[PDB]
RNA sequence: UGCCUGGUGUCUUGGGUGU
């Protein structure tokens, strides 16, 4: 798993709009199946069958989740888009021009 | 760990048969070749040591170190205990036991006379130092026995082997 | 091309193979940061001006050192050994003038970068020792002559007693010795600068120390410094000139764009 | 066989020991690290001659680590067995697979296949031994054996002896 | 053989800036590795400052070995090299 | 100290000896023989032994140790394997030299066409440089077009006429003037024929030709056994979460091995010469393009995607090649980059560093009895509070991360440990702007930690850097040792760089509005009142506390 | 840390900083070389404390080096092309 | 050559110290002939193969060095840079030893 | 007593930024 936090995800693996996010947080939760190992020996169903393929927020960016879009691609599979919003106030080093 | 004064020895293509260790063939390898070099790079001969010479040298060095460590103020057990290192102590104990239980010559003058006989002799001027050490060490009694034990002396028939053996037996303390 | 070139501990400039590029860095062994534009005073001016500035006559009274600047002006006139010393100094100055004017700088340019600024040293001495006032100096002429002569032999660029080493050492400081002798002449010291004794030893010691400090340091990677110093201007810049001409020079092109000759005609 | 050899050692010293007693400390460090060691190339180093007057030279400071590196040259007594050499020994153990002897610091194992057949191993004897009609070799018995093979280890040497030829066996 | 005798040393008698920098760095590293300090420290704590104080008093126990192009070398003690 | 202990002595390279690899040496240094073209055993993990991904070649997986050395991924250097070629092939990089050597010697007796009897030949042999020696010997022996079975007495020659060799791609044509005009035959010079001719060259002739008997023997220019590089040289890449991609070198080696198998199969079964020529020429092409895919005069080897194959030669050349892009200049750690700004209130040799950059970068400070108290305070403060620390490094080399430590207050520092403390004030750092035209473009400043996110410079140093504050960015590099810190503070420091060796004049001066204001302020009719004079005098850091009359 | 920065560091004369930048602050690596063949073919097993060069059949004359990983990669790629760069720790003249 | 270089540089009023151009023109004419600053001039020297291959024609230089069994003495600065060693330049142009005599105080 | 995670493609191409 990614070192970020998964606690902001909903039941369907998608974050909800209006939630403040920080760098490395997980905004899309996705897993890919993996052939199980011999852990079925004595593991009480607690054996790894899936591998994480989640999408984390960029490390240097943070903001508010603005709008989450869920639809189907041309192939009929699920397809999501997450838009993040933040405000940038001028500060020392910002470039201006006439 | 320790490095010999002989270096280089880089890659080549020829392979030689005089590379394998063999006492009978007197092939002692590069690090034990007949010609050596000292710290000044000058010519030097391979220095073999018979059990008498080795015992004399080790006793002298050990007693010198023991005297030095006590500020310059005989027992083999105490002498071995002088050295540092439990494994080193055991190794020197074993070497001292071997030398004592097989010392053909425990006297400095007897060893000096034996070395003079084995070096200054006209026949021995060609004898290899390893052959000399083997002769003074094994304490052989017969020409046939010495030749069987030392195959190198078989090809050196210009040696007064029997009378030299009798001289060594005489010098050997009964 | 120039990366592996470095000043070694014997003064030579060699590449990685050990091949000699120069027998002395910059042909004088100095560092590029420790030089300044100075004027050599024996080059310019007419012969009359040179004679007036540098010649000292101890027989003629009106052509001698002024009496109010020296305490010992009474027992100077009529001395012959001191006149011999002064004549030797003036002959050395004339030889320096001839050497600079006929061999080194034929066109008479006298403003060149040289180590240790002499004018700054002299005015520092004047400020330090309060060399104002009409007070007479106590600095005898033989002290001046011998001090300057000895100083011109302690500017070590190369150490060693080898004869070839001594010849190279003498060659390496010719221009600088000419400068020093031009500035520290007897008449100029006694009249123009009015140094006393203590100021004089201070000036000599300072000159020697600063010269020792202005040498190049073994381990300089002078090849890279030279390459950067040549390439830096090129970024900020009928015959061909500019980058195309530099490219022609560096490539050693056989057929340059505008070949030319500069034919000089005979005097008549 | 014992020899005199001129050997050299590389000694690294930590800066915390940069004191007036540096040279003597290097000497004892060399003695502790060389006396009794076993190198396959040379054999066994038993003693170092002139151990209190060894030249150490000038140590070189390793760039980036501060520690000084010293090159120490010394003369030492070295013992090394050779293939096809006959030497004296003392039996240290008796076993059905063969008997183990000691030649100085080296321990030599001789298998039954290299022992004359008449020297049948007797386990009932006290102590158990490889004995014949006129020969009896047990623990502590002098034996003359010929070294056939030597095995090189990290810091150990394993030799194999034989008594199957003439002038060998019990002495 | 390769070493040059003290009487015939012909290199400069001054500490070049590269030698000064390398000596200060090495001494600072050694002090930071708990080497004995040969000068009294009033209130200084920086290894580089202690090294500079040692150098100013000619107390650094290091030797410069200057390599000539042919392979021969001269050994100069830091206590006998003049420092500006 | 970052490497696990190894008892072998540590030394530095003093000489690099080049040469060719003999087939004997290739077989000796190899650890496995590569023969099966299939990369994967059964697509069930555990790659096939004897294949291109044999576990003995080395390990590139974290949980898998090398089967040859037993070391982990971080320590295994990779081990070579060898592939036996059915028929010898030309080395693509030596074909012109092979042609020259064929021109220099006789193709039958294997001896030079000229001898020391010729004064010019002896003069040429007298030279020392192998390349110039070979050039001179070739210039002489090129004209000699016939072997002499007799002295020009027998010179060892066979008397046969020497053919004229012409190059055509990877094939060499030898034309014999068989016996005015008659019918001459030009026949192919196969690599095997040239190889068995070269093996008969005497060592003295080999030395005369510029080759070295010990290191560069002429017949080693023909490839008979191929070394297979370890997977470290040709790592695989995971294109997506499921499918990984084989490297270009792996595919090329698979093609070469398939061609070798094809040649071996064809040879033993049935031998139409046309088929043999076609298949052996295919093998030669594959081997040649595996090492050089820019051979002028023939089409390049292409991937299934249509892109040309990245041969080994292409790996080493260009700006992005090995030498220029990874050895002469490489990406480095402990560095920062951000926009620069101006600060009139900074000393000349000071740079203003943001707090976040100061927290990210670090300097390992050795714990001694002069700073153990301060370093313990830094360790307590943690990696989020300034001043703080990021790691504690023990003597054995283990790193203690202070982010993930629950008992940071329960850490006692021993002498000799290292604390990777935060960047602090007056730390020397190297500061740089591109392009670095001259040596004043890299100078060492003293750190001053400041708020906001821009580097800050005194405006006098904007001239040597050729920098202004309209968006420029500059690079900062942190020294990581006492020796390096001393070098930066004693050699590259800004005050030492004021005067340049290029024109023996200063590179920094008063600039911009300070210059304008010092002109306006020093006019003859500028007078200042007492109350303003007091403020102006207090602003001078070096003022001695005495007001001028 | 490109080539021009390397040239600037050479001009300053700071060899230690350059070595640290290109080794410690970057791809530093440790290899073992045979003291005879000079190749990086030593099969070193640090935990068992045994080193061995099969081609030369030696166990003693073996040294370790600290070289950039890119240099190791370059030498291995050269060996892949039948070129043998041999690294020796002593000069011969 | 010096006159031409100075003419090019000083046309726009710029000034470069004499010793730099002197070093350049002494390098260009040190072999008895004009050595152009190109691969055909620099790479035709006797310098180490590793130093020469770092400039231009890397692979060809490496093959020529291998076939001719060239020996590189690792005396240059490029060789020591690409091997991660202390170059024999600047602060690396000497060695520091430990003064066992002075430590006796 | 229920007890905490560091691991990130590659190759092309395009558009930009500071000189
Ligand atoms: Mg700008
Ligand atoms: Zn491995
Ligand atoms: Zn012929
Ligand atoms: Zn080897």
Q: Concatenated DSSP letters for F101-115?
A: HHHHB-TTT--BS--
Cβ B132 vs Cβ D2: under 8 Å: no
Q: Which residues in chain F have Cβ-Cβ distances shorter than 8 Å to B7?
A: none
**G90 within domain boundaries:** no
Please check whether residue C234 touches F, CB under 8 A.
Answer: no
CA distances from F172 to F98, F140, F290, G3 (A): 10, 22, 20, 42
Q: How distant, in Å, are the alpha carbons of C133, D58, D76, D90, F350 from that of B76?
A: 94, 37, 20, 19, 72
- N- to C-terminal Cα distance for chain E? 33
Please give the residue range of the domain that contains residue D6.
1-82
- C-beta atoms of G67 and H84 within 8 A: yes
C139 touches C197 (CB < 8 A): yes
Chain C residues 80-139 with a CB less than 8 Å from chain F: 113
| Longest alpha-carbon distance in chain E | 46
Residue A73 CA neighbour count, 13 Å, CB half: 6
Whole-number Å distance, alpha carbon G58 to ligand 4 midpoint, is: 7
CA angle B1-B7-B12, nearest 5°?
120
Residue labelled with tokens 């142009």: H93
Q: b or e along F191-216 (b: 16 or more beta carbons within 10 Å of the residue's beta carbon)?
A: beebbebbeebeeebbebbbbbbebb
The residue behind tokens 């014992």 is: D2
The sheet carrying D129-131 orders its strands as D120-122, D129-131, D136-137
CA of F76 to the centre of ligand 2 (A): 4
Which of D82, D107, D131 is the C-terminal boundary of a domain?
Answer: D82
Q: How far apart are CA F394 and CA F419, in angstroms?
A: 9
Q: Give the range of the structural domain holding residue G28, as residue numbers without chain letter.
A: 1-81
F91 vs F223: CA distance, rounded Å: 6
DSSP H48-91: -HHHHHTTS-HHHHHHHHHHTT-EE---SHHHHHHTT---SSGG
β-pair type (G86-88, F15-17): antiparallel
In 3D space, the residue among G7, D8, B91, B17 whose CA is nearest the CA of residue C1 turns out to be: G7
CA atoms within 13 A on the CB side of C7: 30
Residue F317 tokens read as 């050349």
**Ligand 2 ion: residues within 5 Å (CB):** F 58, 66, 68-69, 76
Nearest to F366 by CA among H28, H22, B152, E29: E29
How many Cβ atoms are within 10 Å of C110's Cβ, its own excluded? 16
**Is there a single domain that holds both residue D72 and residue D143?**
no
CA distance C206 to C215: 15
> Which nucleotide is closest to F238, CA to C1'?
I9
CA distance H56 to H61: 9
| Nearest one of F476, F467, F456, F507 to F344, comparing CA atoms | F456
Q: Can you read off the two tokens belonging to residue A98?
A: 């006439």
C–H CB contacts, 8 A cutoff, strictly below: 116
Residues across chain F: 549
Strand partners, E75: E65
Which residue is closest to I19 in terms of CA–C1' distance?
Answer: F435
Residue D75 shares a structural domain with residue D27: yes
Structure token digits, residue B46? 């391979």
Distance from CA of E43 to the nearest CA of C (A): 33
Q: Which residue has the tokens 């640090």?
A: G46
Residue bearing tokens 């002469």: F328
Q: Classify burial at D10, counting beta carbons within 10 Å of its beta carbon; exposed 0-12, middle 13-18, buried 19 or more.
A: middle
Element at A67 (helix H, strand E): strand A63-72
Up-side HSE of residue E69: CA atoms within 13 Å toward CB? 19
Q: Do the beta carbons of residue F246 and residue F39 sit within 8 Å? A: yes
Q: Please state the separation of Cα C22 from the chain's center in Å.
A: 21
User: Taking each helix axis from N to C terminus, what angle separates B129-138 and B108-120, rounded to the nearest 10 degrees?
Assistant: 140
The span from the CA of B53 to the CA of D49, in Å, is 13
* Strand I close to F74 by CB, under 7 A: no
- CB A19 within 8 Å of CB A64: yes
Q: Which residue is nearest to nucleotide I18 (CA to C1')?
A: F472
Residue F332 tokens, joined? 């480095």
Is G87 inside a domain boundary? no
Tokens of H68: 């001719």
Q: Is F158 annotated as a binding residue?
A: yes
By residue range, what is the domain housing residue E52? Answer: 1-84
What gap in Å lies between CA H50 and CA H80, rounded to an integer? 10
What CATH number corresponds to the domain at position E28? 3.90.940.10
- Supply the DSSP symbol for G25: T
The CATH number covering residue D159 comes to 2.40.50.140
Other CB atoms within 10 A of residue F517 CB: 11
Are C248 and C240 within 8 A, CB to CB?
yes
Residues D119 and D101 in one domain: yes
Is residue C55 within 8 Å of C65, Cβ to Cβ? no
The Cα diameter of chain B in Å comes to: 59
Q: Quick check: helix, strand or coil at residue C223?
A: helix
Residue D102: beta bridge partners?
D90, D107
CATH 1.10.150.390 fits H48-92, yes or no: yes
Which residues have a Cβ under 8 Å from the Cβ of G45 and sit 6 or more positions away? F69, F70, F71, G51
Neighbours of G (≥3 Cβ pairs closer than 8 A)? B, C, D, E, F, H
- Ligand number with the minimum distance to the CA of F200: 3
Q: How far apart are CA F270 and CA F280, in angstroms?
A: 14
CB C177, CB E28: distance < 8 Å = no
CB C235 within 8 A of CB G18: no
- Using DSSP's 3-state secondary structure scheme, residue B68 falls into helix
Handedness of CA C154, C158, C162, C164 (dihedral sign): negative
Phi, psi of A67 (to 5 degrees): -165, 130
F117: phi then psi, degrees, rounded to nearest 5: -60, -40
CB contact under 8 A, B57 and D77: yes
Give me D159's structure tokens. 């030799």
Bridge pairing between strands B3-4 and D98-103: unpaired
Tell me the chain F residues in contact with residue C32 when contact means C-beta distances shorter than 8 Å: 500-502, 504
Buried b (16+ CB within 10 A) or exposed e, A65-79: beebeeeeeeeeeee
Give resolution in angstroms. 3.1
A4 CB contact with strand I at below 7 Å: yes
For residues C16 and H47, the answer to whether their CB atoms sit within 8 Å is yes
Distance CA(B148)–CA(B144), nearest Å, equals 6
Helix residue ranges per DSSP H, F8-148: 23-29, 95-104, 119-126, 130-143
**DSSP state, F386?**
S
Rounded distance between C-alpha atoms, residue C58 and residue C66, angstroms: 11
Residue B52's Cβ-side half-sphere holds a number of Cα atoms within 13 Å equal to 24
Residue of G15, G22, G28 lying closest to H90 (CB–CB):
G15
Which nucleotide's C1' is closest to A1 (Cα)? I5
Q: String of b and e for F441-475 (b: at least 16 CB within 10 Å)?
A: bbbbbbbbbbeebbbbbbbbbbebbebeeeebebb
Closest-CA residue of F relative to H63 is F93
Which nucleotides in chain I lie closer than 7 A to a protein CB?
Answer: 5-12, 17-19
Residue F23's φ and ψ, nearest 5 degrees, are -60, -35
Q: Are strands F442-450 and F350-354 parallel, antiparallel or unpaired?
A: parallel
Residues facing B45 on adjacent strands: B35
Q: Do D55 and D22 fall into the same domain?
A: yes
Query: Gap from H84 CA to I9 C1', in Å?
Result: 29
C-alpha B136/C-alpha B113 separation (Å) is 12
In chain H, what are the helix, strand and coil shares in percent, each to the nearest 5? 50, 5, 45
Q: Is F154 exposed, middle or buried (0-12, 13-18, 19+ CB in 10 A)?
A: exposed
What is the rounded CA–CA span in Å between residue E37 and residue E29? 12
Strand partners, F302: F308
Residue A66, helix vs strand vs coil: strand
**Which distant-in-sequence residues (6+ apart) come within 8 Å of C63 by Cβ?**
C55, C56, C57
Q: What is the DSSP string of F234-293?
A: S--EESSSS-EE--HHHHHHHHHHHHHHHHHHHHHH---HHHHHHHHHHHHHHHHHHH-S
**What's the CA gap between C25 and D56, in Å, rounded?**
39
Consecutive H or E run containing A26:
strand A26-28
Q: F455-457 and F335-342: which strand pairing?
A: parallel
CB within 8 Å: B11 and G36:
yes
Q: Pairing state of beta strands A63-72 and A20-21?
A: antiparallel
Reduce the DSSP state of residue C68 to 3 states and report it. coil
Hunting for tokens 């997506």 — which residue is that? Answer: F240
Looking across all nucleic acid strands, the nucleotide with the smallest C1' to CA distance from residue F403 is I6
Other beta carbons within 10 Å of F380: 14
Total domains, chain G: 1
CATH of the domain at D2: 3.30.1490.120
Tally of helices (H runs) and strands (E runs) in chain A = 0, 7
Structure tokens at A16: 């909800």
B·G CB contacts under 8 A: 14
CA gap D21, D13 in Å, rounded = 12
Q: How many residues does chain G have?
A: 93
Cβ pair D124, D97 in contact under 8 A: no
Residues in chain B within 8 Å Cβ distance of D165: 148
Please give the distance of CA H32 from its chain centroid, rounded to a whole number: 18
**DSSP assignment of D36-80:** T-EETTTEEEEEETTTTS-----PEEPTTT--EEEEEEEEEEEE-
The CA distance from F215 to F213, in Å, is 6
Tell me how far the alpha carbon of residue F155 is from its chain's centroid. 49
Q: How far apart are CA E49 and CA E39, in angstroms?
A: 12
CA-atom Rg of chain A in angstroms: 18
Q: Is B51 exposed, middle or buried (0-12, 13-18, 19+ CB in 10 A)?
A: buried
Which token pair is F295?
A: 């051979």
Distance from residue F160's CA to the centre of ligand 3 (Å): 6
Peptide bond into F387 cis (omega under 30): yes
F147 is in an annotated binding site: yes
Cβ proximity of F132 and F123 under 8 Å: no
Place of tokens 């070139």: C5
Count of the separate structural domains present in chain E? 1
- Please return the burial class of C128, using the count of CB atoms within 10 Å of its CB with bins 0-12, 13-18 and 19+: exposed
Query: Hey, what are C79's tokens?
Result: 């001395």
Q: Tell me whether residue G56 is annotated as binding.
A: yes
Rounded CA separation C219/E20 (Å): 12
* Gap between the Cα atoms of D120 and A18, Å rounded: 95
Which residues neighbour ligand 1 (ion) by CB within 5 Å?
Answer: F 468, 470, 472
- CA of F275 vs C1' of I16, distance in Å? 56
CATH level 2 (architecture), domain B49-174: Up-down Bundle (1.20)
Q: Say yes or no for a CB contact (<8 Å) between H99 and E64.
A: no
How far is Cα F408 from Cα F390, in angstroms, rounded to an integer? 11
Radius of gyration of chain D (CA): 22
Please identify every residue whose CB atom is under 5 Å from ligand 4, which is an ion.
G 34, 36-37, 53, 56
Tell me: is residue G8 an annotated ligand-binding position: no
Q: Check H71 against F16: CB less than 8 A apart.
A: yes
Alpha-carbon span D63 to E22, nearest angstrom? 10
Find out whether the peptide bond into F344 is cis, omega within 30 degrees of 0: no
Q: Is F91 annotated as a binding residue?
A: no
The distance (Å) linking the CA of F406 with the C1' of I3 is 14
Using DSSP's 3-state secondary structure scheme, residue F83 falls into: strand
Determine which helix (DSSP H) or strand (DSSP E) holds D4, and give its type and residue range. strand D2-13
Going by the DSSP 8-state scheme, the letter that residue D158 receives in this structure is E
How far apart CA F433 and CA F440 sit, in angstroms, is 10
* Cβ contact B8–G88 (<8 Å): no
Q: Which helix (H) or strand (E) holds G79?
A: helix G69-80
Q: Return the CA Rg of chain B.
A: 19
Judge contact between C131 and C200, C-beta under 8 A: no
F38, F27, F40, F29: which is closest to F83 by C-alpha? Answer: F27
D-chain residues near H103 (CB < 8 A): 18-20, 22
CA distance D89 to C181: 91
Residues H81, H86, H89, CA angle at the centre, nearest 5°? 90
Residues 6+ apart with CB under 8 A from B57: B49, D47, D49, D77
Structure token digits, residue D143: 């034996």
Q: Write the CA distances from C241 to B133, C261, H8, H91, integer angstroms.
A: 87, 16, 6, 40
């Amino acid at each position: 798993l990614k070192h970020g936090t998964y606690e902001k995800l909903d039941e369907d693996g998608l974050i909800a709009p209006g939630v403040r996010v920080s760098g490395d947080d997980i905004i899309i939760g996705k897993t890919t199946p993996i052939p199980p190992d011999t852990e079925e020996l004595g593991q009480r169903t607690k054996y790894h069958t899936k591998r994480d393929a989640s999408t984390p927020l960029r490390s240097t960016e943070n903001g508010i989740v603005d709008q989450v879009l869920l639809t189907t691609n041309q192939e009929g599979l699920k397809f999501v888009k997450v838009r993040m919003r933040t405000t940038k106030v001028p500060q020392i080093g910002d470039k201006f021009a006439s | 760990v320790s490095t010999s004064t002989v270096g280089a020895r880089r890659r080549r293509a020829k392979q030689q048969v005089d590379d394998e260790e063999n006492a009978t063939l007197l092939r002692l390898g590069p690090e034990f070749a007949l010609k050596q070099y000292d710290h000044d790079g000058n010519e030097h001969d391979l220095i073999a040591l018979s059990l008498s010479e080795s015992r004399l040298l080790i006793r002298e060095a050990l007693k010198a170190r023991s005297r030095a460590r006590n500020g310059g103020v005989i027992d083999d057990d105490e002498l071995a205990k002088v050295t540092s290192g439990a494994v080193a102590n055991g190794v020197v104990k074993k070497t001292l036991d071997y030398l004592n239980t097989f010392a053909r010559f425990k006297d400095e003058e007897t060893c000096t006379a034996v070395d003079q006989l084995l070096h200054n002799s006209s026949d021995c001027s060609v004898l290899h130092p390893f052959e000399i050490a083997q002769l003074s060490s094994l304490g052989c009694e017969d020409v046939d026995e010495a030749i069987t034990l030392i195959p190198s002396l078989a090809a050196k028939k210009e040696v007064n082997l029997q009378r030299i053996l009798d001289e060594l037996n005489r010098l050997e303390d009964p | 091309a120039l990366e592996d070139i470095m000043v070694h501990y014997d003064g030579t400039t060699r590449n990685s193979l050990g091949d000699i590029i120069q027998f002395l860095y910059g042909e004088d062994g100095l560092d590029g940061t420790q030089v300044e534009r100075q004027t050599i005073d024996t080059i310019p001016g007419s012969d009359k001006a040179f004679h007036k500035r540098y010649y000292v006559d101890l027989m003629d009274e009106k052509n001698s050192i002024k009496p109010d600047v020296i305490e010992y002006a009474a027992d100077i006139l009529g001395d012959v050994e001191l006149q011999k010393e002064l004549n030797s100094e003036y002959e050395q100055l004339v030889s320096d003038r001839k050497f600079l004017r006929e061999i080194v700088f034929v066109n008479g340019d006298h403003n060149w970068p040289l180590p240790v600024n002499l004018r700054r040293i002299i005015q520092n001495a004047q400020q330090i020792f309060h060399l104002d006032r009409a007070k007479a100096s106590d600095l005898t002429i033989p002290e001046i002559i011998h001090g300057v002569r000895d100083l011109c032999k302690k500017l070590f660029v190369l150490r060693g007693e080898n004869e070839l080493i001594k010849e190279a050492q003498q060659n390496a400081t010719s221009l600088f010795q000419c400068l020093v002798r031009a500035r520290l002449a007897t008449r100029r010291i006694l009249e123009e600068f009015r140094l006393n004794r203590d100021a004089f030893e201070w000036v000599l010691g300072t000159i020697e120390a600063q010269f020792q400090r202005s040498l190049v340091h073994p381990g300089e990677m002078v090849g890279v410094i030279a390459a950067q110093s040549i390439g830096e201007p090129a970024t900020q810049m009928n015959v061909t000139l500019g980058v195309p001409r530099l490219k022609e020079i560096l490539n050693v092109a056989k057929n340059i764009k505008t070949p030319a000759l500069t034919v000089y005609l005979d005097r008549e | 066989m014992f020899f005199l050899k001129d050997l050299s050692l590389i000694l690294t010293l930590h800066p915390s020991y940069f004191g007036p007693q540096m040279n003597q400390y290097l000497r004892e460090k060399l003695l502790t690290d060389v006396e009794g060691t076993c190198t396959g190339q040379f054999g066994y180093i038993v003693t170092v001659l002139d151990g209190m007057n060894i030249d150490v030279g000038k140590g070189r400071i390793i760039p980036g680590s501060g520690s000084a590196e010293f090159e120490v040259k010394y003369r030492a007594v070295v013992w090394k067995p050779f293939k096809g050499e006959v030497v004296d020994a003392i039996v240290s153990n008796v076993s059905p697979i063969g008997f183990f002897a000691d030649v100085g610091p080296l321990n030599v194992f001789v298998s039954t296949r290299l022992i004359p057949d008449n020297l049948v191993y007797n386990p009932s004897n006290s102590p158990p031994a490889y004995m014949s009609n006129d020969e009896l070799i047990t623990k502590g018995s002098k034996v003359r054996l010929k070294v056939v093979g030597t095995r090189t280890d990290v810091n150990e040497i394993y030799a194999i002896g034989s008594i199957k030829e003439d002038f060998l066996g019990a002495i | 053989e390769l070493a040059i005798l003290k009487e015939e040393r012909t290199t400069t008698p001054y500490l070049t800036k590269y030698e000064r920098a390398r000596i200060l760095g090495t001494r600072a590293l050694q002090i930071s590795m708990n080497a004995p300090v040969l000068v009294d420290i009033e209130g200084e704590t920086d290894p580089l400052q202690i090294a500079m104080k040692e150098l100013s008093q000619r107390k650094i126990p290091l030797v410069i070995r200057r390599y000539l192009p042919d392979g021969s070398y001269e050994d100069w003690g830091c206590d006998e090299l003049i420092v500006d | 100290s970052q490497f696990p202990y190894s008892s072998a002595p540590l030394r530095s390279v003093k000489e690099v000896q080049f040469g060719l690899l003999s087939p004997e040496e290739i077989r000796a240094i190899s650890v496995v023989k590569i023969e099966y073209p299939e990369i994967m055993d059964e697509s069930r993990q555990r790659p096939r032994e004897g294949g291109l991904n044999d576990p003995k070649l080395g390990s590139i997986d974290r949980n898998f140790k090398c089967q040859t050395c037993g070391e982990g991924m971080a320590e295994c250097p990779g081990h070579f394997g060898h592939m036996e070629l059915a028929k010898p092939v030309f080395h693509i990089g030596f074909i012109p030299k092979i042609k020259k050597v064929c021109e220099c010697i006789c193709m039958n007796c294997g001896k030079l066409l000229l001898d020391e009897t010729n004064p010019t030949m002896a003069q040429a042999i007298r030279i020392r440089d192998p390349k110039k020696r070979f050039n001179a010997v070739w210039q002489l022996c090129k004209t000699k077009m016939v072997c002499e079975a007799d002295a020009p007495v027998s010179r060892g020659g066979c008397g046969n006429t020497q053919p004229v060799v012409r190059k055509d791609g990877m094939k060499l044509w030898g034309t014999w003037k068989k016996s005015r005009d008659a019918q001459p035959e030009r026949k192919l010079l196969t690599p095997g024929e040239i190889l068995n001719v070269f093996k008969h060259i005497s060592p003295e002739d080999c030395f005369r030709l510029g080759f070295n008997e010990d290191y560069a023997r002429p017949e080693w220019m023909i490839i008979t056994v191929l070394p297979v590089p370890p997977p470290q040289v040709r790592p695989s890449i995971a294109m997506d979460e499921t499918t990984q991609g084989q490297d270009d070198l792996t595919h090329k080696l698979s093609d070469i091995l398939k061609a070798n198998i094809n040649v071996q199969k064809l040879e033993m079964d049935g031998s139409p010469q046309h088929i043999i020529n076609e298949v052996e020429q295919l093998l030669q092409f594959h081997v040649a393009t595996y090492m050089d895919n820019d051979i002028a005069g023939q089409p390049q080897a292409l991937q299934k995607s249509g892109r040309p194959v990245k041969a080994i030669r292409a790996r080493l050349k260009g700006k992005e090649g090995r030498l220029r892009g990874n050895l002469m200049g490489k990406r480095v750690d402990f560095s920062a980059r951000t926009v620069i700004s101006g600060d009139p209130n900074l000393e000349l040799d000071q740079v203003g560093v943001p707090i976040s950059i100061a927290k990210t970068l670090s300097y390992p400070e050795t714990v001694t009895q002069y700073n153990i108290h301060r370093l313990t305070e830094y360790v307590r403060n943690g990696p989020n509070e300034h001043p703080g620390a990021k790691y504690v490094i023990r003597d054995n080399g283990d790193r203690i991360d202070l982010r993930y430590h629950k008992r940071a207050g329960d850490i006692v520092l021993q002498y000799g440990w290292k604390v990777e403390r935060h960047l602090m004030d007056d730390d020397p750092v190297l500061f740089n702007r591109q392009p670095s035209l001259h040596k004043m473009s890299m100078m060492a400043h003293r750190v001053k930690v400041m708020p906001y996110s821009t580097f800050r410079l005194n405006l006098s140093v904007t001239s040597p850097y050729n920098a202004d504050f309209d968006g420029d960015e500059m690079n900062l590099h942190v020294p990581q040792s006492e020796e390096t810190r001393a070098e930066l503070s004693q050699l590259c420091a800004v005050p030492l760089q004021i005067v340049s060796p290029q024109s023996n004049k200063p590179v920094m001066g008063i600039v911009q509005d300070t210059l304008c204001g010092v002109r306006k302020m020093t006019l003859r009719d500028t007078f200042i009142e007492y109350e303003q004079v007091m403020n102006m005098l207090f602003w001078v850091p070096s003022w001695d506390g005495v007001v001028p009359q | 840390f490109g080539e021009m920065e390397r040239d600037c560091m050479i001009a300053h004369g700071a060899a230690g900083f350059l070595k640290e930048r290109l080794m410690e602050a970057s791809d530093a690596f440790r290899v073992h070389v045979c003291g005879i063949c000079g190749l990086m073919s030593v099969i070193a097993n640090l935990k068992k404390n045994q080193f061995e060069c099969r081609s030369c059949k030696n166990k003693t004359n073996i040294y370790q080096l600290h070289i950039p990983y890119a240099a190791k990669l370059l030498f291995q790629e050269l060996m892949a092309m039948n070129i043998a760069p041999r690294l020796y720790t002593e000069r011969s003249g | 050559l010096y006159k031409e270089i100075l003419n090019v540089i000083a046309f726009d009023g710029s000034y470069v110290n004499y010793r730099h151009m002197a070093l350049l023109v002494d390098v260009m004419t040190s072999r008895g002939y004009l050595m152009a600053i190109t691969r055909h001039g620099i790479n035709r020297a006797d310098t180490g193969a590793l130093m020469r291959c770092s400039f231009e024609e890397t692979v060809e230089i490496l093959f020529e060095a291998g076939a001719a069994a060239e020996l590189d003495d690792c005396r240059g600065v490029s060789e020591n840079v690409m091997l991660g060693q202390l170059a024999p330049m600047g602060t690396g142009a000497f060695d520091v030893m430990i003064d066992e005599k002075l430590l006796t105080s």
